[PDB]
């Protein structure tokens, strides 16, 4: 997904699927559309839900990636708190 700004409905579906690869790919697809500068908050609860505690680095690294380029803007699955869904289980 080079740059496709309407694809956020499919990404939500792909983000949790019971297959780790699909989830990683989805979250990756979100990153590439934001970096170009395209739509991203719809997904947030889905994105945040699988990855949170785990020591399994790749999804964690992917989520960690998305928190330095848009964390502030996206708020469906995060909202505003001191120990946000950016860092609460990332302790």
């Amino acid at each position: 997904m080079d740059s496709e700004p309407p694809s956020e409905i499919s990404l939500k579906n792909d983000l949790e699927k019971g297959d780790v690869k699909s989830k990683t790919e989805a979250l990756k697809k979100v990153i590439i559309m934001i970096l170009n500068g395209e739509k991203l908050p719809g997904l947030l609860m889905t994105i945040i839900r699988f990855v949170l505690p785990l020591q399994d680095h790749t999804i964690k690294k992917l989520l960690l990636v998305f928190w330095e380029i848009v964390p502030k803007t996206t708020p469906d699955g995060r909202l505003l708190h001191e120990m946000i869904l950016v860092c609460d289980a990332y302790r």
Binding site: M45, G77, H81
Partner: protein
């Protein structure tokens, strides 16, 4: 079947989960995070998300709401100071659109303790009678003995 089990810290959520999964009473630590496990009961495989109840984590439950078929809300029946707080958490949880049709099962837990509030008392304090929009049930439990646990899984499976 997808299940979300929450409640305030120390209610007994992880004790419940690992009693169900291992038939064992484990020595818990506060859960900073979740535990997720699959349990077989009578041809149903329940995937239970036990999400820690301390404040930081409490702020995160909303990410586990979506796709939830049923909600286990664990209450420490012996703690009277925090019952109002439980009531407050649970009431706005009931207002959550992703939790809209999910089956609501309250566990009044630590029923084994001498001064534990009764399930009826708890039902009045949590305002359970006022839920008309979906299925609810309250069950007295003791997670250490295992009492009431499977009666819960039973009720849940009949959603």
């Amino acid at each position: 079947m997808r299940i979300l089990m929450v409640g305030l810290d120390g209610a007994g959520k992880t004790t419940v989960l690992y009693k169900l999964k291992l038939g064992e009473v484990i020595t818990t630590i506060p859960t900073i995070g979740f535990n997720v496990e699959t349990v077989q009961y009578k041809n149903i495989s329940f995937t239970v998300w036990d999400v820690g109840g301390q404040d930081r984590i409490r702020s995160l439950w909303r990410h586990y709401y979506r796709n939830t078929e049923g909600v286990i809300f664990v209450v420490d029946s012996n703690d009277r100071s925090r019952i109002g707080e439980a009531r407050e958490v649970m009431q706005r949880m009931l207002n959550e659109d992703e939790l809209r049709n999910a089956a609501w099962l309250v566990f009044a837990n630590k029923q084994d303790l001498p001064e534990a509030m009764s399930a009826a008392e708890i039902t009045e304090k949590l305002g359970l009678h006022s839920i008309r929009n979906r299925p609810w049930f309250i069950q007295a439990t003791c997670a250490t003995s295992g009492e009431g646990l499977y009666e819960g899984l039973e009720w849940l499976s009949n959603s």
